[PDB]
Every structure is written in C-alpha cells, then in structure tokens.
C-alpha cells in the first residue's frame, strides 16, 4: 500500500493534487525500482480525472526531499545491458513525467540529492524551503559514475553549460540562494509556507517563458563547445591525470546531448552508463564509500558515552590552536587554554583568528558569528575554571617525565569524573599514564599535521582505558566532524608506523642520484597526491625524521634510514616550511611556477652516481613496502577490522582511491603473484623487500582480503 506506494497521492478540495514521498524503509527518501514501478500506476491514476489546475510534490519528511537512486541494486547489476537498461527506464520515466501538459511542482524540503535532481529537472515548477538543511546536488562523479537519465542533458539545456559541466564533473552542494540566483529553483520560501506557496504557483498555469541563459553558453554545439571541451579535458587530464574514468565520458555524453540532440545524449547516456558501471574504479569508489558510511554509522566503543560540555587544553601555540579552533568552530564546545606564556595564548588565539578571518574575508560568515565563535575560546595560565572540564588535551612538549607531570597536575587541579586525552607523537599511552589515579580516563589522541586539512586521527587506548572514555572520544571526534579509528597501543601506532618505509627507500633511491622530476612524477602519477619530498617540505624535515629511531629499536633494520642525509640536512637547517628555507624556496619571481629545487642539495645529499630504472620500478617498490607493512600491522591486528585498515590507508596517507585502497589493490592484485613480484626486487636490490609471513601465507594459498573478495 502506502508503504510500497510511497508516492501517496491526495487531491485537495481544489483542482490541485499533492504527492507525498515517504519510503517506510528509513528517513532517507531513496529511489527503488518499485518506486519507479508504482509511480507509473500513480501517474496513470493521475491521468484519470483530468482537467485540474496541477500537481505538487512534497518532501513529506522533515529531513530530506529525496536521498536519490539506490546503488546497492546498481552493484547487483552485472553487465552493460543491465546498466544501460537501468538508465533507459530512468530516461523514459523522467520524460514520461515531463510529458504531462499541466503544471507540476516539486516543493522540496531538506536534502534533494542524486536522482531527485533528475526528477527536479523534469518538473516545470521547482520550489525549495529556506532552511540551510536543504540542498541540491549530483553526488556521483565522486563515485566514478555518471547519473545519466536525461538530467545530465536537461541541466545544460536548463542552465548555461559553463556551470552545468562543472556541476557534473564536480558534483557538489548548491545553496537555495545560489540556485535561485542562477535560476535553477523557481523560488525560495519558508518551510512553514512551503506547501501553500506551491499551491498558487501550481494553480498558475503554463508559464511558457523559458529564462534565457548567460548568452555565453550558446556555444554548445557551435564554435566554443569544442574549445570549452578541449580546455576542460586538458585541464582535467592535467588535474585527474587520466587514472579516473567518468571524465571524458561526461564530455562525450554532454556534447552528443548538446551538439547532437537530447535523444543522441539519451542513447550515449544509456550506453556510457552501461560500459562504466563495472569500471574497476567504480566499485573501488563504491566500496570505499561503503566503509565511510560504515565508520560514520559506527559508534566506536560499545559502552554508552558520557556527556561532554567543557574541555581543557594544556599549553598553546599553532599546534594547540588547531584543536582550539576546531573545538569552538566545529564542535562548538567551551574550551580553556592554559599556556603559561601569554604569547602562547596570544599565538593560538591569533591562529584561530586568522582561520576565521579568511572566512569573513570571503564573506562566508558574519562578523557577529566570528564573535559568537570567538566566545567559545578561553585562555589563561592557571587551573581556575578547569575544575569542571570533562576532557583535557595537552599541547605540550613530549617529555615523558613532563607527561607524567601533566597527568598528575590535571588530576590534582580538575574534576574526578573528567577524562584526559593525550596528543602524543612518540610515547606510549600506558607509558605516558604509568602512575595515574584514573588511567582508564586517559586516552591517546594521535593528531597530525594541521588538523583542519586531514579529518583522520588515531584512537590509542592502553591496557587500562575505560570503554566510556573511548565512547566519549569516538563521539567527540565525530562531533568534531573527524575520523576516529582505534589503533593498537604499539610502537609507531599505525600511520607513522607504515609511513616510515615510504620515504625510507625513496631517500635510498634519492641517494643514488635520483632527480626531482623522476621521483616526484613516479609517485604522483600512481594516484598518490603530494610527492614525498614536497611532503617532507610541508610536514617539516625536522619532523621528517619524526621518531624513526625507535622504529629500528622496535622493529629492527626494516625501518632503518640511510645515514649522512638526515645528518647532512639537520646541520644545514633545511626544514622545508618550518624554517621556510627548504629545498623548495618561496618568493620566486612571478610566483606562478612549481616550487623550485636547490642545485646545492644534490651535493649536500650523497647523490650516488645517476638515476636509473623507471617510474613504475620506483612506484612498485615504494608501494609494496607499505603493502608489506600494511599487512604487517594487521598481521598483529594493529587495526581491529580489515575495512578499518583499508579505509585509514586510502584516506589518511593518500592511497589512490581508484585502486579502492591497498586491501582492494592487493585483492585486485590477487595472490602470491604480487608476492612473487616482490622477491625479484628483493634479489636485485636488497633484503628490505622480504615478504610478510601472512603475505606468503595468504598469497600462496590465493586467499582474499575483503572477506569474500575472491
């Protein structure tokens, strides 16, 4: 009934019929084949009792108008024909709705995403609520998939191609104000009068006045379309490097939709959707999206958490400000800083000021909003007001005795129910706790480079750590809009543990007379953003060595780094951006070129002879060490779940998403074949490439990784 017929129709006393959208499955109004099926029954019933003013569509749910098309059924498709026909039935149904001669209104509240825009493109009248929660967007190119159903060619028909194409290539979120500004939505009305405002517009009959485009988008088809298509494709290839599908396909389907007609775009959209549904990057993104939803839906600790209303920060500075800026601007929770030097208070406050100042400089936020956001920030040098801080984070130096000093004073000079979070980089959490009144309320929060960039952090409990402490921690990071992952309290934890071999062999090769262009291009071409050397420039060469000495102390020569390079750079201080005088100098003339390389670094480094081999040889050897280490950490289960392990590597470090993550990639690479690949490199180069015991155990047997992967 209405459960199946989620489009429960109702004709009012007037000549206007209202159609609800209430799928009983969940609060998200998703699209199902049954929904596509029963709507034909409803529209046929709508054909019954004709001669009425019009029809309207409502969200009928306080959260969203429509979630979009379900992808689980798309994942159940096998070949192109299933996907081609799936587009075709979508292509026909939208035009069939568009074939109506009366005024059709989509009064949308909340999120309208995915296939809803295709439906929105079908309706002649479109109106949306004024709430910030509502938004319009085509989120599928991020999935490596095109949403071909007619809207991909109706939107450039509806709106200038200058904005339509970037919408398709960069499927994003558009404000109701923005859409009305460009004319996508006919009008914006408050949620209270959202339904009624549609009624008179629906009764208003056939506004046969199509708004004109910018008049610069008429080039689609005639001269200009190819110039636009050439410029975007070349820039995209300059951007995406061509290892991402569903980019040129958009250019093809748009051109044939524009320069060859809607039907020509229709068939191409069906055909392109078919051939692309099984592209290996597609399900790579789909599986990646699955874990992202899974971790977002994951509650972390199974124990119920505790209320969180006030937080403390020990020490200050730029690093301290990063937590402070996020906690106020993102989490919106009161925070107290206790840097003894007011300059440390001054610096952290200045940093958060600068972060918010640019937003207002863009007119992104109101000036009063800054004052409202600045209100959550509090600094001092004493423990007053800290007595009621539920959580405390240290932004202090990593001296162990000082760390045990930190836990003692905060225990002495705060509440008892309060928990403590440690932002360590080297010292173990239980080692940090050591002697503690309530070590179970002490948790390890491995933060990273400027936290506003990467939303990933490490959850590091120790032998004694209350599950509720994690539960509060897990809720907090999510409440901070971040990515909590429980990492076993092990030397190197997970991320920095696996990151060390990456630059290690890179330096080993770089010491053997490698040039900047070859080493840089090798990694960036293999789907790895920001190459190693510029990565070390930004993270800081001083931090480039990090705490890798303990890595040899913990796991032997496998993490050994070559000598007379860290020495050759620490003495002649070249920290990248920490000192500014990295091998990538700034202030170059024009300042419109790649970061220049010093010629003097090569003599400073050993630079043994000249570079050899090729980028794949560099790429294959570098990657396998992470793979050899990624299996290694999960071999002792540093990470609790395989998907948790895969998501961290693909999202935090920057593993190529089109590879689906290393666990997908090794599943994609299969079995001992890649294991066989990594012994020949060991023989020709050295014993750093020894296989992991499980790596041969799984590889030789042909074992899979993504559960029932193969």
């Amino acid at each position: 009934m209405e459960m199946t017929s989620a489009f429960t129709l109702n004709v009012r006393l007037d000549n206007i019929a209202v159609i609800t959208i209430d799928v009983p499955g969940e609060k998200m109004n998703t699209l199902k084949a049954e929904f596509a099926s029963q709507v034909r029954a409803i529209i046929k019933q709508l054909r019954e009792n004709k001669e009425l003013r019009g029809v309207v569509f409502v969200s009928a749910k306080p959260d969203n108008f429509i979630a979009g098309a379900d992808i689980n059924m798309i994942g159940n498709c096998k070949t192109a024909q299933e996907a081609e026909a799936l587009a075709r039935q979508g292509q026909q149904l939208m035009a069939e709705i568009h074939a109506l001669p009366i005024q059709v209104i989509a009064a949308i509240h909340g999120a309208c995403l995915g296939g809803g825009l295709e439906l929105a493109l079908a309706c002649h009248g479109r109106v949306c609520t004024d709430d910030p929660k509502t938004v319009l967007g085509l989120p599928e190119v991020q999935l490596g998939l095109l949403p071909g159903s007619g809207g991909t060619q109706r939107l450039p028909r509806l709106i200038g191609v200058s904005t339509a194409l970037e919408m398709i290539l960069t499927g994003k979120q558009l404000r109701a104000k923005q859409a009305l500004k460009l004319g996508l939505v006919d009008d914006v009305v408050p949620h209270s009068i959202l339904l009624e405002a549609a009624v008179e517009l629906a009764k208003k009959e056939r506004p046969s006045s199509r708004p004109l485009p910018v008049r610069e988008r008429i080039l689609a088809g005639p001269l200009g379309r190819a110039l636009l298509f050439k410029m975007v494709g070349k820039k995209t290839e300059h951007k995406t490097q061509g290892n991402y599908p569903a980019t040129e396909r958009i250019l093809e389907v748009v051109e044939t939709g524009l320069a060859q007609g809607t039907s020509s775009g229709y068939d191409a959209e069906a055909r392109a959707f078919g051939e692309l549904a099984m592209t290996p990057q597609s399900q790579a993104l789909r599986s990646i999206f699955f874990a992202s939803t899974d971790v977002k839906k994951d509650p972390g600790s199974d124990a119920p958490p505790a209320p969180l209303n006030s937080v403390g920060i020990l020490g200050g500075g730029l690093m301290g400000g990063g937590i402070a800026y996020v906690t106020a601007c993102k989490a919106g929770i009161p925070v107290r800083i206790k840097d003894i030097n007011p300059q440390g208070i001054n610096h952290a406050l200045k940093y958060s000021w600068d972060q918010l100042e640019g937003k207002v400089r863009r007119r992104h936020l109101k000036a009063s909003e800054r004052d409202k956001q600045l209100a959550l920030i509090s600094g001092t040098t004493d423990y007053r007001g800290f007595a009621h801080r539920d959580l405390i984070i240290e932004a202090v130096f990593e001296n162990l005795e000082l760390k045990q000093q930190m836990v003692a004073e905060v225990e002495q000079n705060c509440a008892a129910h309060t928990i403590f979070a440690s932002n360590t980089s080297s010292l173990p959490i239980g080692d940090i706790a050591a002697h503690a009144t309530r070590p179970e309320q002490v948790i390890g929060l491995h933060f990273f480079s400027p936290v506003e960039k990467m939303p990933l952090v490490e959850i590091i409990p120790h032998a004694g750590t209350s599950a509720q402490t994690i539960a509060t921690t897990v809720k907090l990071a999510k409440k901070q809009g971040k990515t909590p992952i429980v990492v076993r309290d092990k030397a190197g934890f997970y991320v920095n543990r696996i990151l060390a071999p990456y630059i290690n062999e890179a330096i080993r090769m770089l010491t053997q007379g490698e040039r900047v262009e070859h080493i840089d291009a090798a990694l960036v071409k293999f789907g790895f953003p920001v190459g190693p050397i510029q990565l070390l420039d930004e993270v800081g060469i001083d931090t480039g060595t990090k705490i890798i000495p303990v890595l040899e102390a913990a796991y032997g020569e496998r993490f050994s780094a070559p000598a007379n390079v860290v020495s050759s750079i620490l003495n002649d201080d070249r920290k990248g951006r920490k000192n500014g005088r990295g091998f990538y100098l700034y202030g170059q003339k024009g300042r419109k070129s790649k970061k220049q390389v010093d010629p003097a670094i090569y003599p400073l480094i050993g630079t043994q002879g000249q570079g050899r081999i090729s980028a794949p040889q560099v790429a294959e050897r570098c990657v396998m060490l992470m793979l050899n280490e990624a299996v290694r950490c999960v071999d002792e289960q540093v990470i609790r779940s395989v998907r948790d392990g895969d998501i961290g590597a693909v999202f935090g470090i920057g593993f190529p998403p089109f590879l689906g993550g290393p666990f997908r990639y090794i599943d994609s690479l299969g079995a001992g074949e890649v294991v066989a690949i990594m012994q020949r490199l060991a023989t020709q180069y050295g014993s750093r490439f020894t296989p992991c015991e499980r790596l041969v155990e799984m590889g030789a047997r042909g074992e899979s990784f993504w559960k029932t992967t193969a």
């Binding site: 107290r336 007011p342 300059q343 001054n346 000021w353 004052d371 509090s378 600094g379 007053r384 007001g385």
Partner: protein, 436 residues
Amino acid sequence: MGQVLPLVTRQGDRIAIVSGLRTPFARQATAFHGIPAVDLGKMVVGELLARSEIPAEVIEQLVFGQVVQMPEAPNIAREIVLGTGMNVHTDAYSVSRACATSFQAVANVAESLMAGTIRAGIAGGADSSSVLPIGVSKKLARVLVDVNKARTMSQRLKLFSRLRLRDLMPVPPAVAEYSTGLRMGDTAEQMAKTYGITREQQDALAHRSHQRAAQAWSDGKLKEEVMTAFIPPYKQPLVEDNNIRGNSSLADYAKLRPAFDRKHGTVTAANSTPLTDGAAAVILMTESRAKELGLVPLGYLRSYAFTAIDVWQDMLLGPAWSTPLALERAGLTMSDLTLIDMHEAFAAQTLANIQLLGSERFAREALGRAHATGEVDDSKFNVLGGSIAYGHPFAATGARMITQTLHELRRRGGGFGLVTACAAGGLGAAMVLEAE
C-alpha cells in the same frame, strides 16, 4: 530615631558580594584604541564567569551603565547577553547616573533582590575615552530631518540652499555641566580658592598616591582582580595600567602650568585624573544563594547613601553630605572604620573634603548635624594610592575602589571600609562595606 537601614531581604538574609574584576586601564589613544566599551565589557564578563567558574544559569539579572553613552546600542546591557554566551532569559537593561553609575548600578539591583525579585545579579560599568561619538551641528541635523521627509525632488535643492561653511564642522564634546557651563576642575579651583588648597599640597598627595600606586604593582597585589587584555591584532597582551607614574618628584609636579585657572589655579595635569579607558563588573548575589550553591562572599554590604546638592557652588562636596547619611544608615562611626576611601577626582576638592569632614561648623549648619563627621586618618585614607594614579574610566571608578577595598580589608581583619565618590550636577554618593 536612629535612621538605620538594614540591608536584608524579606527572609532577613543580608546582601553578599562574592567577587568582581576590573579590566586594566589604558590612557586615551592607547592599546584600547578603537575598542568600543561594549567589547571591553564583553571580554571581562565572559572571563569573569570563566574565572568565577559558576554556572551562567545561576545569574538572574544583569545591569550595565555607561558614561559617554553611545548611539548604536541604547541598552548595551542586553547587547552583552546577546554578545556573550549568557542565557537570554536574564533581564538586562541599562542605567545612567553621572560618574556614580557603579554605585547606582549595584543599588537598584541590590534593592530589587533585597525585595526578593531575584537571587543573583550582575552590575558593571565601563567607558572608553579613546572613542568619541562626535556628531554634526544641530542646525545641520534639522535640515537632514527635513530632507528625508521631503516629497518633491526640486524641494530638496531649495531645502539644501540654507548652508554654511561652519555647518559641516562636527561639534567636539564637552565636559562642563550643561546647566552651569563650568568644567569639573573649575568647581575644584574655586573650592581651592574657597577653603585654601595650595598646589604644593595638591601636588604632594599626587606624589603620595603615585608612590603608593607603583608600589602596588611592585607589590603586585592588584593582580587577582585585574585581567590581562588580549587584542584582536594579538601583537602582545597588556598587564598593567600605563597611567601610574610612581617614579616622580614633587618638584616635577610643580613644573606644570595650571590648566583651568592659568593665573591662580592650583591644579594641573599632575594633580588631576586623566582620561583613561577600562571596564569593571561585580557579581551581586545574596548570602543565602551563595551558601546554597557554595561560595564564600568577598565581604558583604552594610549601607549606602546618595545625595543631590546645588550645582553652582560647592558642587563636588557630595560625599561630605552623603557620608553622615551612610553612617547613620549603617549605624556606625568614622572611628568604627578600618579603612576610609574617597574618589580622588581632584587634589583641590579632596583636601577640602577632609577639612570639611572635620569642619564642625559646616556640618552644624549646612548639614544641620550635631557634630562634624570627623577627621580622615591618612594612614587608612587611600592606602593603595587612588584616582590620581590609575585614571578615570568614569564608570569603572566605583568598582576599582571596591575591589581594592574588599581585598585590603581581606588583607586585614574584617573591619569596615568606606567608599565615596562625588559626581557632576551636585550629585553625591556613598556606600559602606562590611567585608565580614
């Protein structure tokens, strides 16, 4: 009958003063440059609650007054609640009574909660001499009032015909009394001519206060009630008042030409408060509520007085009139006073007050009292320096005396402190502290 005023609620609980804080003062056109007094008030109160660490829902009312009232926000007190994280349901409104706003701000709040309408209240005041709301001439204002109401386009040009070269010049502000036209120092100068105040003794107290002033920061006792300012540029925080020049000589004071009466006046910049900017606020909240939520009050309240007198002559004698009223309401004695303090508006007016406070005749005839108030012991008189040192942020002047007084009486036995201040328009105000 002894006109004593028991300052207790309906239940009989006396009024408690748990704490307060003062924003450090800066001269005009200093680190507090371009900083509206609302911003200074916002930062102090937010920190004060943070320093007080008490819940904001406990506070049931706040009142904030302002000298040099600003046009954009008529009721800045409500603006603070909106500007801060204070609960909106807190009944914020603004007042204005000369320089004794702080005395006024506590008084109306106290009597309201003494009546029992609320249980927790906030009083505060601030001013910023660095920022001025300078306006256009009155005649130009009427023309602009005419033009916006004008209906015809051609009417405006004829309406704009009436213009003058001096009409465009903005009017500078003035400090002289509106109904009198005499500056505050002019009143002090004639009293200096009246009762006899030589510049050397006028300069001597400035030396005494200044030595007491710098020593206070040298002792650093005025730290727990004074915040360290932070500025949005975040170049460097400010810690101490710039006005205090405690390294001075009495001869240096005598090397200034008189300001108002350049012929016989005995007052200069040395013996006159300059224009300083700052903020202050104090929590007003009854002992029963304090005990209920577990705080120790920084003293209590015993009595207070307010008086209005003639503005033409002897206009700055208000505390002298108010003092017996406060003492009679307190049912106490000048001897029954650990510390005595008055607002050091001018050296000329101050010494006359002690003279007049000890003047048997004046109290006998002008006040009609049986005896004079008494002689002011200089040992307990302005122990921590005074207004000729910190400066005059106008509204915060009341609280800055309160903080030091309670702390100084906290530094000693319970005792009884005295706080008085004169005001323009012949307005006098007095208040009596218990400090347990």
